[PDB]
Design a protein around this ligand. Structure first.
Ligand SMILES: Nc1ncnc2c1ncn2[C@@H]1O[C@H](COP(=O)(O)OP(=O)(O)O)[C@@H](O)[C@H]1O
Ligand SMILES: Nc1ncnc2c1ncn2[C@@H]1O[C@H](COP(=O)(O)OP(=O)(O)O)[C@@H](O)[C@H]1O
Ligand SMILES: Nc1ncnc2c1ncn2[C@@H]1O[C@H](COP(=O)(O)OP(=O)(O)O)[C@@H](O)[C@H]1O
Ligand SMILES: Nc1ncnc2c1ncn2[C@@H]1O[C@H](COP(=O)(O)OP(=O)(O)O)[C@@H](O)[C@H]1O
Ligand SMILES: [Mg+2]
Ligand SMILES: [Mg+2]
Ligand SMILES: [Mg+2]
Ligand SMILES: [Mg+2]
Ligand SMILES: [Zn+2]
Ligand SMILES: [Zn+2]
Ligand SMILES: [Zn+2]
Ligand SMILES: [Zn+2]
Lengths: 406, 421, 411, 421
C-alpha cells in the first residue's frame, strides 16, 4: 500500500460533472491547507461516498481531487478483500490507514466498496474499516473517498455520521457534458478540422465517460488502420456503430410533457421555482395546492393541446394530482360543500357523502386541468422554443427557461 | 443457497427441440470459455427466456446447457418468493446473485418467472440483472408458460432480451422423446415407438415420460421382464385433440387477429401465425405480450391494440354467426386495458384525468363500467367492420393456415403484402 | 456488543430541553448510586421512551444521562434488527443484555425502536420483552429508547414493567435555539458582529441537528475564504444553505400560525366552558354544552385563519379531525342528536345506509354550527386577537403570569 | 401449570375492605380443614366473584385468602385464553382443574374473568366448575370490573353464585392502605398520612401504593434517608373528583334508575342505590347485570328492563333540560337489547319471527334500524312520563342520596314503600 504511481489528473480532466466538482472543491481547499478549517472549527467529512453507474468517472473524480490538491492518493479495491484468508483482511485495512497517516494530508480511495461493505470474514474486515474511520483525526487532512453503483447493498453502519455521511451522485452526462468529455479525450489527438464534437455528442445519448473514451479510441484506431494522420468526422461517425435507445417521436413527447410541467409551474403564482428540466412548506394554502395541482397536470395538458392524443406518460401525475385533491376535500376542509370535516380515517361515511366527495374531487382536478390547458395554449410559442432547446441539449436550466418565457 | 446436486444432463437427453438446441449451442460455447467472446467484444445476452407450455422440457434445456458446459446450475422456482414475509424475497434474490458470482461461470435458472414478474422482489431482481458483469460468465435463464403476464421491464435490453419458444413436439419429435426415456428400459421386440408417437397427438415430453412409466408398471404388475407393445397401447388409455371443423375455427380466429392487426394503423407487425394447439408462436399469444420496445403508449395505440385483441372473436362471429370460448383470454385482456384507460390513464371522456382506484362511490363505479363497456364494444364493432371488409383476405389466409400450420418470416410477409398491397 | 467509544457528554451539551432534563435527573442519580434507591425501595422504571421528531436530541439526552452518571452507554439501532436472518435477531438481543448485566450500572439505548416494535420481527421483539421482564432493575440497568413514531409501537412494549415511562422531547423555541447555538459555538471564534439572538429568531422550525449543522456551514464558509473568525454574514448565508440540503418556517407562515394559535386562545377564553389556556407558542362526565364549547375552540385557529386572511391552510387538519371525532361521538354514542335519538349507532357500523346518511348530516351540522360560532367570536374580538398575535410574534411563546395577565387586560 | 411462587399474603396486608374480609373469613375456615363443614353438610360455594374497579385489591384478597389458609394458589388471567389457537383454550382449562385437584385443598384464581365469560373455552370452564367436588377443598375465585359483560351461565347456582363487591376506599380506608405500604419504609416525623388520605379523594389501593413509591423516589433523588411530608405532598401532583352540581346530576341519574324500576311492573327489585363514583353497588350498574334467576324472558320484561335502563337519562333531561355523557353505557346496553329483540328474538312487528344476522339486504338493514329506534324511543319516552309523574318521589330520593351516599337494605325498602305505597 503506497501512493499511486499513476498519471496526475485534475478537474480539467473530468467532463460533465460540474455539480459534483463543485461539491468537491471545498475538499480540495481543505487538503491544500487543513489549518484554514481547523483553526475555526470547520469540520469536514471523514468519508465521502460516490454513487453512480460504472464508467461515469467516480474514480477519475477521486483522482482529480488528489491531483488538484497535490496530495498523495491511495487507490484500493474493495473486491480485493473478499476471498481473503482469516484475519488478512483486517490487517490490510489497518496497514492502509497506517500509511495514510504517515502521508497525510491525502485521499484514500476504496473502489467497489459494496464488495466489503455488505457473512463471515467480511464482518471482521468491515468492522476494522469502521474502527479505523472512527480512529483517524480528520484534522490531519485525511479523507477517505469511496465509490459504488450499488448503494442499497451497503451496511448502514457505514453511512452513519462520522463515517460516510456525504454522498455525491454522479450521473450520465447530458449532451454538453458528453461534448466536454470528447474535448478532454481528444486534447492530445490529431483531429481533422471537419470533426464536429457537438454532433458526436448529440449522436451518443446514453454514453458514459468510459464509453466516450472508447469511441475516441476506436476513431483513432480506424484512421491508423487506414494509414492516416488525422482523425476525421467520418471516423467518429463510423466509430459510434463500433462502441454500440428511445424514439425521436417519443423524445418529442417527453420534451413537451416536461416543458409543460415547467411552463405551468412558472406561470402559476404559487408554483415551485424550476431548477432543472431533463429528458433522460409546513403550512400550505388552498391556492398553493391548486397551483401545484395545476402544474402537476401541465405535462398532460401539453400533450393534449400539441398532439391531440394523450399518452400513458402522465399516469403518475394523475395519481398525484388526484391524491392532493382528495386530501383537500377529505382532510383539509377545503371543499365547497363538504365543510370543515374530516371524511375518513378507510371509510366511516355514507354513500351520499362518498358521491359528493367524488364530484368535488373531480371538479377540482378538472378545473385545474383546464387551467393548465389555457396556460399552454397561451404560451405555445415559448413552449415550442423550450422544447426546441430541450431536444437538442437534453437538459435545461431554470434561469434559461424563465428567460425564454421572456 | 447451494448449486443443484441433481443428475447432470446434456442435449443428448433432450428430444424434439433441435431449433432451440441450435440457438443455445452458442451459450454453451460461451460458458465453456467466456474469454473467446470477451477478447473480440462478442456481447452475449444476460437473460434468456424459455417460453412454452408445461412439460415441454424448458427446465431440461436449462440443465442441458449447464451440463453441456460442465458449469454449476442454480435452480430457483418463481413461486418460492411469493408468499414470503417483508424483505425475505429481496434478500433471497441478493443471495442468489452473490452465489452466482462466486461460482462463475454458471447458469442461474428461475422457473415460473411469471410468479415474480407480474414489487420489492422484482425490483431487486431487475437491479441484480443490470448489476452483474456479463463477462464473468453468468447467464440467467428463466422459463414461463405465461409470457403475457410478465413485467415489460424484464424484457428490456440488458435483461431477458432473447427468448426461445419451445413447442409441443410433432410425431417425429415424440418418437425421439420415447426413444430417450426408453434407453435403459427392456423392450419387447414387438414394441413400435413409431405407432406410439402417431397415436399420441398432443402429448408433451412430460406426458410421454409418464406414458413410459405407466407401461413399465403394467409389465411389473404381471411380473414381466420385457415391456410389450400391448403395455404401451394400454398405457395411453390410462393417461388420457382437435376436429376438422374446430381446426377451421382456430384458423379463422388466428386469421382474425392477423387481419385486424395488419389493417389497424398502429397494429403490431405480424411475424408469424400458427394453429398448433398451443404454440406460443401464434399471433393470438403475441398480442398478449407486453410492449418491450416503447415506454409511452398513446390512446389510439391502445384502441388499435384493443381492436386487434378482439379480432379473433370478430372473425368467429362474422363467419360463423356464433362465438366460442376460444376468445376468453382476449376478452379478459381487452377488458384490463379498458379499465386501465379509464381508471389510471385518464383516457375517458366523462371521467376526466383522474385516478380511480376501490376508493370511490357506487355512482362512479357505474360510470366506469359504462365507459369501459363503451370502449370495448366500439373496438369490437370496429374489428367486425374490418373482418367483413377484408373477408376475402381472411378466407385466403385461413386456406393457407389450414394447409401449412405455421407461417413464419419472409414467406409470411409476401402473403400479407400480396393481400394488402 | 460493546459500550460506545464516542465522546462522553453531559447536560452541559444539551440545550433548550429543560423539562426533559428535569425528569431525567432521577435517572442520573439512580445510576450514580442505585443503593440510594434500593435502600428505601424506590422502584425505578426499567425502560424510558423518548418521543419527538428527528434531530431534537433524543440520542443526545440518553448519552447525556450516561455521561452525567459516568456509566457505560450501549448505542443500538433498531434498524439493524429488521432484515436479519432466521434467529440472528433474538440472539443479538440476548447478547446485548448479557453484556448489559456484565457492565451494570449502564444505559442500553435503542434508537428507532419502532423498527423492531411495530415472522422474525415477532421473535426478535418477543425476545426483547423477555429480557426486559428478565433483568433486575435493582442492578442499575436502564433501557432507553427513541422514536418519533410512537403510534406505530406495539402496546406490549408500553406495559408496566417495560417502557412504562415516557418523556417528550419538543423542538426548540427561540430561546432554546439561542442556547443550542451558544453551545455549538463554545469553542469557535466568532466575529463581534455575530448575534445569535437574531439568528435564533430567523430559524424557527430548526431542530438541534439543524442548528449544529448551521454552525458547521457557517464555519465552512469562513474557512473557504480563509477567514479566521465566523461572521454574521456567514450564519445568515448558512441558513439558506442548510435549508437547500436537508424545513424553515417562513415569516408569512409564522404570521398564519400565530393567528391560528391566537385563535384557539381567544375562542377558548370567550367560551363559557373553555379550557383555561396556560401557554401559546408558534412551535368522567361531560355535558353537551361543554362539548360544543370544546368543539368551538378546536375550530378557532381555522376560524382566525379564515376571517383574517380569507384563505385557509393545511394547518387545521388535525383540529378538524379532532372536531369531527367529537361530533361523531356526540351523535353515535352519547345520544346527543336532534333526530337520531338516544341510540348507540356503531359497535364498526351495523346500520343501514339510510342511517349512515343521517349521521353524516347530523355530524356536519354540529361542526358547521360550531365553526360559524367560532368565526362570530373572532370577528367580535378581532382587536384582542390582533394584540395577542403582535406579542406572540415577538416572543414566539407566551406563558404563565404573563399569559395570565394578557388574557385579563384583554378580556 | 405450576402454583404461584409469589410472596404469601394475609389479610394483615389488605386495608379498607373489612366488609369483604368478613365474608371471606368463612372460606379460609373451609380451606384450612374442609372436614368440619363436610361432616355436618355445610355446603360452600364453588365460585366467588370479586367485583370492583381496578387496583382495589381484588387479586390481593384472593391471595390473602390463600395465604391465610396456607393453601396453594393458582393465578390465571382471563386475557391469556382469548387469542389462542383452535382448542388450546379448552385444554388449558382442563389442565388448570387437573392441577387444582392434585393439590387440593387450593384456590384457583381467574382474573379478568369477563375476558372468557362474554365458546369452547367457556363451555369447558362451565363443565369443570360443575365437574369438581366442592368437598375436596377447591374454591375458584374470579375477579372483574366488568360484571355486566359476563355470561349469565357463570352466575348460575353451583358456580359463581356468591359475589363480593369491593369499593374504592374512603378517607379512613386510604389511611390504612398508606400505613401498610409504608410499614417497611423510613418516614420523617412530620409525615401525616391522615392529611394524605384526606387529600387523595378517589385514589384506590394501586394508586396509593404508587404515590408511596413516587414519594420514595423524590427522597432517593435527593439522596435522603427519610421520606418527608413534602415528598408525599409533591408525589400526589405527579400521579394526578366531583362537583356539588355534578353530585346532583349523578344523584338524579341514579334516582332515575330507581324510580322507573320501581314503577315499571316487571322491574328488577331495587336493593341499593349509591353515588359513590364507581361502586358496583349502584343500581346503574345492577341494571346492566345479566339475568341469573330466569332462563326465559318475555317481550314485556325486556321493554320494562329497557325502560329502566333509560331512566337515568330520562331523569337528567326532565329535571335539567339537557343531558350528559353519563348515560352512554345505558344507551349502548339499551340498544343491544333492542337489536336483539328485533334480529334474534323475533319480537318486532314488521320483521316477523326471523333471525336476521350481516346476511341481509340494505332494505332490511333499514327496517331493522327503524324498528330498533322505535323501541328505544318509545321506551325512553315512557321513562320520561314516569319521571314526571313521580317527580316528587324522585326529588325526595335524591335529597337522601345526596346526604347518605349509599342506601342498602331494610332502610332502602322503608323509603321506597313510604314513597310508592
Ligand atoms: N466525466 C468524465 N470525464 C472524462 N473522462 C471520463 C469521465 N468518466 C469516465 N471517463 C473515462 O473513463 C474511464 C473510466 O472511468 P472510471 O473513473 O473508472 O469510472 P467509474 O469510477 O465510475 O467506473 C476514466 O478513467 C476516464 O478516462
Ligand atoms: N423434449 C424432451 N425430450 C425428452 N424428454 C422430455 C422433453 N421435454 C420434457 N421431457 C421430460 O418431461 C419433463 C418435462 O418437465 P420440465 O423439465 O418441467 O419441462 P417444462 O419446464 O416445460 O415444464 C422432463 O424432466 C423430461 O423428463
Ligand atoms: N438540544 C440540543 N442541544 C444541543 N445540540 C443538539 C440538540 N439536539 C440535537 N443536537 C445536536 O444534533 C445532534 C442531534 O442528533 P440526535 O441526538 O440523534 O437527535 P435525535 O436522536 O432526536 O434524532 C446531537 O449530536 C447534537 O450535536
Ligand atoms: N385494599 C388494599 N389495601 C392495601 N393495598 C392495596 C389494596 N388494594 C390494592 N392495593 C395495592 O395495589 C394493588 C392492587 O392491584 P390488584 O391486586 O390487581 O387489584 P385489582 O384486582 O382490584 O386490580 C395491590 O397489589 C396492592 O399492592
Ligand atoms: Mg469502475
Ligand atoms: Mg413447466
Ligand atoms: Mg434520529
Ligand atoms: Mg384489576
Ligand atoms: Zn409528468
Ligand atoms: Zn385470440
Ligand atoms: Zn390548532
Ligand atoms: Zn345509568
Amino acid at each position: 500500500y503506497k501512493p499511486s504511481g499513476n498519471k496526475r489528473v485534475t478537474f480539467k480532466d473530468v467532463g460533465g460533472a460540474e455539480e459534483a466538482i463543485e461539491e468537491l472543491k471545498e475538499v480540495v481547499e481543505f487538503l491544500k491547507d487543513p489549518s484554514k478549517f481547523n483553526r475555526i472549527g470547520a469540520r469536514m467529512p471523514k468519508g465521502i461516498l460516490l454513487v453512480g453507474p460504472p464508467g461515469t468517472g467516480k474514480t477519475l473524480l477521486a483522482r482529480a481531487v488528489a491531483g488538484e490538491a497535490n496530495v498523495p492518493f491511495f487507490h484500493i479495491s474493495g473486491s480485493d478483500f473478499v476471498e481473503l484468508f482469516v484475519g488478512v483482511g483486517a490487517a490490510r485495512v489497518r496497514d492502509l490507514f497506517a500509511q495514510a497517516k504517515a502521508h497525510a494530508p491525502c485521499i484514500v480511495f476504496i473502489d467497489e466498496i459494496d464488495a466489503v461493505g455488505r457473512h463471515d470474514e467480511r464482518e471482521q474486515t468491515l468492522n476494522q474499516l469502521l474502527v479505523e474511520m472512527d480512529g483517524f483525526d480528520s484534522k490531519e487532512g485525511i479523507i477517505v473517498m469511496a465509490a459504488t453503483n450499488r448503494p442499497d447493498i451497503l451496511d448502514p453502519a457505514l453511512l452513519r455520521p462520522g463515517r460516510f455521511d456525504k454522498k455525491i451522485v454522479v450521473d450520465p452526462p447530458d449532451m454538453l457534458g458528453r461534448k466536454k468529455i470528447l474535448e478532454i479525450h481528444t486534447r492530445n489527438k490529431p483531429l481533422a478540422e471537419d470533426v464536429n464534437l457537438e454532433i458526436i455528442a448529440k449522436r451518443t445519448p446514453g454514453f458514459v465517460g468510459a464509453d466516450l473514451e472508447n469511441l475516441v479510441n476506436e476513431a483513432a484506431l480506424l484512421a491508423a488502420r487506414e494509414g492516416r494522420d488525422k482523425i476525421t468526422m467520418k471516423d467518429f461517425e463510423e466509430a459510434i456503430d463500433r462502441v454500440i435507445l428511445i424514439s425521436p417521436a417519443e423524445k418529442r413527447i417527453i420534451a413537451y410533457h416536461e416543458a409543460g410541467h415547467a411552463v405551468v409551474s412558472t406561470v402559476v403564482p404559487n408554483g415551485e421555482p424550476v431548477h432543472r428540466i431533463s429528458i433522460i412548506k409546513y403550512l400550505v394554502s388552498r391556492n398553493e395546492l391548486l397551483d401545484k395541482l395545476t402544474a402537476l397536470l401541465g405535462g398532460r395538458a401539453a400533450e393534449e393541446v400539441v398532439f391531440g392524443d394523450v399518452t400513458s406518460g402522465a399516469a403518475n401525475d394523475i395519481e398525484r394530482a388526484t391524491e392532493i385533491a382528495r386530501n383537500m376535500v377529505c382532510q383539509l376542509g377545503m371543499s365547497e360543500e363538504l365543510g370543515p370535516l374530516a371524511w375518513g380515517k378507510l371509510r366511516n361515511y355514507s354513500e351520499e357523502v362518498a358521491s359528493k366527495i367524488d364530484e368535488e374531487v373531480k371538479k377540482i382536478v378538472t378545473n385545474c386541468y383546464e387551467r393548465a390547458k389555457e396556460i399552454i395554449r397561451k404560451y405555445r410559442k415559448q413552449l415550442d422554443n423550450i422544447v426546441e432547446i430541450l431536444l437538442e441539449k437534453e437538459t435545461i436550466e431554470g434561469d434559461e427557461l424563465r428567460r425564454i418565457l421572456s
